[PDB]
């Protein structure tokens, strides 16, 4: 009923998205950026979407292009699946406590495209989350949310009330958006 | 079931309110103050009330008396429609993102009359919203919420987390109260 | 289905807790600390638990030991009643307006044990609430929440946005936790 | 071997102390000030003394006189039991973590009488610990340590590194002194 | 006598711990995070434990999950090996000088779960220790200590008095905890 | 078993040191600088060393050269007596209360040469301790500790937590080092 398939081929990347708004958390993400995969898995899961993401990009340069192209594609998919946006709750919000971190997200699905990202500690402008593969620079967090809000054409406010650990700060934000989205897309019985 | 009709004749104004708490957003507002009409329409709509407001007042002087008398009348109507307040959720809250603005409202319907209004930028103390008719002075926003809370006999906290545009700041607040009220008046299945 | 009985005998105190998560607000609390009884009644009631607390302790010394032992016991009971935590909403939050005070609580029931307590005015570090019996020192508020979060093994963030009266500040917090818990333990239809 | 019995009759109070330095924590304290009893129990226990304190005083006025007279008597007993102070470790110290509080104590048993008390938060100058009986004013903490150090004729430095709860701050200090004393009085194998 | 074996399978990781409190420093650690291995080796060695750690996790994402799961598992093992905690010294502390760095740790093994981590320079919130494999982000230091304290159910205060080098600051802390633990678990001859 | 004899002839001075780590406090010091003799006596005594120091130097110029040469020689002797440093506790620390002063010392005997000297009041940079003979300038305190740490090849941190009297500040430091050393050199039963 509320599905969307988006293919997006740029010079930097090639993306395929499959999105079902009324899913059960069946999520499979592979972008070549493992921490981004982890975040998009959290997104899909906590939003109760069925989400398949397959992305290959110029990760030798860095993750930026891949992360950004995926977010654009994902936003487009979200907007398409929403459709005319009839009979939905439209507004959604969520607080996410994650150990010492507390994040919050609020959405208006019919509201004009906008993104406000506030509260994130300053050290996230130059923090890296690194494993055995392509690393993740937390400075991209802003971009990811902006890109999604811009391409889904929704109002999205994301706040970090407080927090220390960059893994927790980042993950809390993704989960906050997921749960705000979940509430907003749900059918309204009025 | 939960209806109320209030007639209020003062020297300054004459007001009629018709309110159904369990409505479908059938709203008709005419106070002679067009921007106030726009706000009360947003209120009724987003609260899912059926609301009819008819008000005539000394708008040649200014909107103050009309806006205040309507708010008193509306609060009285809300309180009457609520009745004994049995088996309702009682507590409600809502975040409303409106472009750059984010507003929040929280209510306790059984709690003693109280109103706290915080966060509104200082320039709203001397901002006017003006069209082709009677203008609206944003300084009245406080009064409107206080008057309603006082006459409905409810606890009402309204916060502007941030914002710039006075139309957005004002509209977000009215919508926030509407959606907080909607949640609070809903029947509780416990 | 989701019940728990905890008996806890220390040198300082002897505690019995009976907890049903899926109750109707049938609450009976007797700790020998009347204001604590009032708070635990608010907790049980607003969480829609069925809660029986019976506690005797060394109240001649002060309430601390009794209040702390009860909170540990209560946390243990909450954790046990939750069980495997299958098919619940997991996340919950609540704003509680109480006259001039506004408090907020947010929980993650599956999240690792953690407690953050912020915003409480400084005078609550040396405020006493006193009647005709054992008094209550508001400095214990922190401890109570920490103890519960530690023994239920949950993430619990409690904030006072603003407030003046210590009775209101304390009561709002207890009610906020109750309603956050209520939302989190509720079955999720997904 | 290292025992002492002190009887001290003033106008304000009547005190009996029985002290064995080489005990097993057999402690019985009754001063008419329940929280002081709790602290002196912690002292005796954690020092591994055998300690019997019996005190009656003008508690209708307040605890001050009783608390001070006991501390003087106890210091005298400690000094007498120590004797010539031959073949002991002489120096002792202890850190005591108590939830959020961390306290420290350091002693020189042969060093000239001296007491330094630092780090205690300012609100302890006007904090009361109150149960169902005679209350305890944390401002006396200083006095108790000074009185003991003066009458045992020892160097005693007590520091609160950090802490919030007055019960914890007070109890940590008493336990810190106990364990510093324990180490100092122990026989030195050199 | 005081042994424990813990197996912990999560989605992120799989952990096996073998712990003997009364060991001779026979330590074998393999988590896939070499610097963490180095730290856990220092822990086991300086505590005079016999410790075997085997952990595999999603290190492609980053070390966080593995480091955290190991710490939880290790804390659980420590608590189990401690048992009823009868006839032990209970309190322990240690200063560790490491070149320019000085760190300190203090424990109460019977005290309620708590962790305070103070003094660490600000640049450790965004410092990485990197070799030829999975890197280590010093921001996790806090988490590791908190996780252990939470799962062993002990009071643990860790302080950096001063220091510059992040390798030294981190290593000193791990060694400080090890030696505080060693002293606390030792049998008390009273 | 753990002895050392060091002879050191410079242009400025001629030094003989005899050191037994496992002594009974048999100490005889003569450097021509009486206050230094007093300090080195405190060192040897409180460390439970057997120590003989005989030094003659250009004291007509000032004590500096003699004090420094002795400290170098003494450090060399300490290092030699320690030997391979097998089966010792290695780490040691001590707080020393001396009237109003509190000093602290912490050592790592196997740790790389290092000395940190902190907390000493500023007036000790230009304070003199003078009797009927060669005076002592407290500014040398730093040098003495640095010289020892450098020539014994040990980590040595010395702190003055607080203090006023320069005799007490100086003496407390020497005693603190002595007792830290005593604990570190002691055989470890593991
Ligand atoms: Mn970009
Ligand atoms: Mn007015
Ligand atoms: Mn508008
Ligand atoms: Mn206590
Ligand atoms: Mn406590
Ligand atoms: Mn009340
Ligand atoms: Mn006095
Ligand atoms: Mn994660
Ligand atoms: Mn974590
Ligand atoms: Mn190393
Ligand atoms: Mn020199
Ligand atoms: Mn002297």
UniProtKB/Swiss-Prot annotation, chains A, B, C, D, E, F:
Superkingdom of the organism of origin: Bacteria
GO BP terms in the entry: L-histidine biosynthetic process
Pathway as given in its UniProt record: Amino-acid biosynthesis; L-histidine biosynthesis; L-histidine from 5-phospho-alpha-D-ribose 1-diphosphate: step 6/9
Gene3D superfamilies associated with the record: Imidazole glycerol phosphate dehydratase, domain 1
CDD domains recorded: IGPD
Activity regulation text: Competitive inhibition by 3-amino-1,2,4-triazole (e.g. ATZ).
InterPro entries in the cross-refs: IGPD_sf, ImidazoleglycerolP_deHydtase, ImidazoleglycerP_deHydtase_CS, Ribosomal_Su5_D2-typ_SF
Protein name: Imidazoleglycerol-phosphate dehydratase
């Amino acid at each position: 009923s509320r599905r969307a398939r988006i293919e997006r081929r740029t010079r930097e990347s090639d993306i395929v998205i499959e999105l079902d708004l009324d899913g059960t958390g069946q999520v499979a993400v592979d972008t070549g950026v493992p921490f981004y995969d982890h975040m998009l898995t959290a997104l899909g899961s906590h939003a109760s979407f069925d989400l398949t993401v397959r992305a290959t990009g110029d990760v030798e340069i860095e993750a930026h292009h891949t992360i950004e192209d995926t977010a654009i594609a994902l936003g487009t998919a979200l907007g398409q699946a929403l459709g005319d946006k009839r009979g939905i709750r439209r507004f959604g919000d969520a607080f996410i406590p994650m150990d010492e971190t507390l994040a919050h997200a609020a959405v208006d699905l019919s509201g004009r495209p906008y993104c406000v990202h506030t509260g994130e500690p300053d050290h996230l402008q130059h923090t890296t989350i690194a494993g055995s593969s392509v690393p993740y620079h937390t400075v991209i967090n802003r971009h990811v949310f902006e890109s999604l809000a811009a391409n889904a054409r929704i109002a999205l406010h994301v706040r970090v009330l407080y927090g220390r650990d960059p893994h927790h700060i980042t993950e809390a934000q993704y989960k906050a958006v997921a749960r705000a989205l979940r509430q907003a897309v749900e059918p309204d019985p009025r």
